[PDB]
Structure formats: C-alpha cells, structure tokens
C-alpha cells in the first residue's frame, strides 16, 4: 500500500496508490466508478 505501483486486477490494469476504504458497499458489488468513468475502488478476488 501507499505507493505508485502498477496493477493487474483480473485484467483491469492501471497505475496508482492503494488506500483503505471508508464508504460501504453492496455485498454483490465488485468495483465502483466515479462520474469521470474512472476506477475509484476495486476488490481483491481472494480477500474480502
């Protein structure tokens, strides 16, 4: 966490940092998007 590291979450690439979540999600939710069509949150497939 807390470093500009490249990502590969089941094909979803990117470059950014990792920060712990504060808002709640649906139990059937996988990822979220903002108004800019950008990935704002992603879930680890092996860890909840």
């Amino acid at each position: 966490k807390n470093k500009c590291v490249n990502f590969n979450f089941n094909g979803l690439t990117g470059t950014g940092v990792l920060t712990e979540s504060n808002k709640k999600f649906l139990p059937f939710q996988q990822f979220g998007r903002d108004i800019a069509d950008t990935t704002d949150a992603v879930r680890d497939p092996q860890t909840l």
Partner: protein, 49 residues
C-alpha cells in the same frame, strides 16, 4: 469508432500492427475536443476584457 474508450484496453488485446489504427481514431477525436474548448474560451475572454 474505435473498440473501447480506454487506451490500456486496446494495447492489451490487439497487436501493434493493428493497434495503431484504433489509436488514430482516438487521437483525432480528442484533438477536436481540445480545439473546441480553447476557441470557445477565447471568445468569452474578449467580453470580460
């Protein structure tokens, strides 16, 4: 007119013989959007002047 709207999507699914065609449709699409914003800002900057 391209496949997707993400540049990392086209570079990961296609080959560089064919990937440059879809980037060409995305560069010319976004270049006309930046020329529109500057031109409409330059007319609004004259009325405040």
């Amino acid at each position: 007119g391209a496949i997707s709207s993400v540049l990392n999507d086209i570079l990961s699914r296609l080959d560089p013989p064919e990937a440059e065609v879809q980037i060409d449709r995305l560069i010319t699409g976004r270049l006309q959007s930046l020329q529109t914003y500057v031109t409409q800002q330059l007319i609004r900057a004259a009325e405040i002047r």
